[PDB]
Design a protein around this nucleic acid. Sequence first.
RNA 1: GAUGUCGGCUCAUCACAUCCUGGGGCUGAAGUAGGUCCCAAGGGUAUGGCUGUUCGCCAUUUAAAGUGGUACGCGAGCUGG
RNA 2: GUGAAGAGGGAAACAACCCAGACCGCCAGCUAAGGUCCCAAAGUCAUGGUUAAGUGGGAAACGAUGUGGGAAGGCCCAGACAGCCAGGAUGUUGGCUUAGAAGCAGCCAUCAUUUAAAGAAAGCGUAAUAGCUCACUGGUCGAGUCGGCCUGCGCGGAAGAU
Lengths: 94, 141, 164, 176, 38
Amino acid sequence: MFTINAEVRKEQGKGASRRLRAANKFPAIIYGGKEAPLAIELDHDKVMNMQAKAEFYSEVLTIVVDGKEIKVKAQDVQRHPYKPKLQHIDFVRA
Amino acid sequence: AKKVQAYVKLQVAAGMANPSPPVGPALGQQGVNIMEFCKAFNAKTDSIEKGLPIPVVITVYADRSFTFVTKTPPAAVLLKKAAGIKSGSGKPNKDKVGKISRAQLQEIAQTKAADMTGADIEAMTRSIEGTARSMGLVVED
Amino acid sequence: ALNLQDKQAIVAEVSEVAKGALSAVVADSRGVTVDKMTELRKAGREAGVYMRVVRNTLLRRAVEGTPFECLKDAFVGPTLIAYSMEHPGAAARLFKEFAKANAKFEVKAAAFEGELIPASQIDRLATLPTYEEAIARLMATMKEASAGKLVRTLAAVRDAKEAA
Amino acid sequence: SRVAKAPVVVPAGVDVKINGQVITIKGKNGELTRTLNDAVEVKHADNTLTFGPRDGYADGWAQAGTARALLNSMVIGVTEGFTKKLQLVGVGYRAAVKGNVINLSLGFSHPVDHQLPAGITAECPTQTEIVLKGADKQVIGQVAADLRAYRRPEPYKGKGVRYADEVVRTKEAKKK
Amino acid sequence: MKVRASVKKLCRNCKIVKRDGVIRVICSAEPKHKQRQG
RNA sequence: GAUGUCGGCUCAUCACAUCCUGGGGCUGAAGUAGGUCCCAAGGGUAUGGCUGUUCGCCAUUUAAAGUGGUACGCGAGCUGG
RNA sequence: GUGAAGAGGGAAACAACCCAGACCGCCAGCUAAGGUCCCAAAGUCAUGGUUAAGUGGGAAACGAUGUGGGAAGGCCCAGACAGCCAGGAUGUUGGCUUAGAAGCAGCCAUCAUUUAAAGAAAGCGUAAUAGCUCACUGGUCGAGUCGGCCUGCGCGGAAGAU
């Protein structure tokens, strides 16, 4: 359903990641296949109102980063300490 | 509140609406004087049998003006009669207390025809099917 | 767009028949009342005339999706439509059955054999023998004027010479 | 919100006079029929009323439907004259008009001295039935609302002064 | 009527209306529903 | 190197989550009356016995016999029991 | 860490708080935590968003039809969503139960009819038939509207010795 965008990591680690969530972004990853793990940044509230309809999980994702598309389905979820809001999501290739 | 109900219900034998209890409370509550209704009703009942329930559907307007429609005897009365039963089972469908043929059902249907809204004489039969079904008569093809 | 199909199907279902009707009648009631509707369902199945009560929302999407003749200027506001594709006279009689239980100023328009009929003209028009009874009355009008009238006149002159 | 976009188009020979936020309706057969927008701005234009947000506010839609409603109400007040027919159920109460005075009983040993405002008038056909006259939709119901205050249509046997929106639903007695 | 706290719909004609800083249940079906604090 | 205790009188004072008149909703409240019930500190709010004593038991007043604090009010006042 | 074994600044103040570690003298400037209308020294600061409770600047469970923005999306002038108004029908006051038991006292059937259409009924309410709202049907109606979620702000909950 959803057509979203991503940036390739300027900065990685816990120190890095707190300054993304300060600016209302968070990180993510696309693993699987014969090919390398694609580490990405997303925007938090770009997805937060998408995954409010169940179509985020029933249908595959258009995620474009450095103009590359490989298609993606959701995996297990990392959550903030006191909100169901997304601290980090895992993804698998489709 | 205007205090209107459309298509107010009665089912009563033709010669017994003088007392209020056979008629129940609802006619009073829509403002139809029970005595006045019984007189208006008697003029078309002289060809009806004593004790036999006659269907009556009333519309009452806001200003307590009323009009009243009188109907041919029930499907429920005719089916009890044709089956030789005084009363229903009180349990529909799972308890059988008799059976009724499609060919008897079609005659029950033709006696109700002028009230029936159906476009086929079968359509009519299918409406009275469920009257047989409520009273514990199985509807055989 | 709508999420469900119900509203879009029913526009096509009326449009087919409503372009088709040889007479139709577009009327006002805004709460048609079920006592009347049932007696008009009852005598419509005698004449094979069909009747629908229908929203101006359905009809206005009908004017957009489909071209109409002689009925579409009358689809604004509260509307019943009684219609026949068969027996044109009975369709126009249906409004005289409804006028027995209702107000007669309520027609906005009619169509008759593709003619637009205004709200004031139909009340004369509508007496309307059906197409078989009409054709036979026209056919008698010409058979009579051809040879019967000639003789009427040839008699009337012989009668004046007859002296009493 | 459908009704904050409504342009009204006020009838012929009604004068709707704008001091900005006080808007004043005059015409034949009455005086002091008026409306105040206080949160929102109403421009009158030539006759197409335009409703929007006011300076020094944050608040939205709240007074803009009211202003449309209340102005149209007042334009019909002076144009046709608003509905007049009042009545009451219950023995021995009355509402018999004699001049500026509405005559009633409340069982009291003092005269009740229920009186009509100087800006309205009334008459009576029969001793429990009232006909009120004026061109203001607010006032006629305000003097009715104080005459009902402690004689409001009861939920049980319905007795009260009856006009406009009414709460009575009827009850049957307790089982014996 | 009970004074209460937390405002709820007592019936389909409880409109629920904010008078001053407290939400009141105000109904035009039944006077039974006039709930004082919300 | 002394912040020292109980109950009652006299004399009090302050909090209202009001004993009562008062204004008002609901009611399975017809009205009445009661059940349910909100605002309200303004004002009135009983006595003899036995016990160290509040509370008790008993006789008794009036329409009535309240709620809470005060070095658990008040021994540089009293009974100091 | 501080006091114990330290002065000064800020907190309505204090023997441990937060900043800071008094050699003295100097009507000297900057910075910290903290502040910037008057007490009282400095911003009634510029731009945008929003509430109307002294929330702010006092705390929870809890709740709803309190109120706005936002992005993503269904509905969406070809007519919305919701109310208000009018229709709510044929068998049929089905069978049992009963004073009548009739959509709404109880229990069983949970159906069929001409229908563009009306559940042998979702919820209310003196036991109840009632009165009422309700989809669905059609008016009024000609523009925003609602479910989910992010988010600013609210609420009542929050009654006592001076």
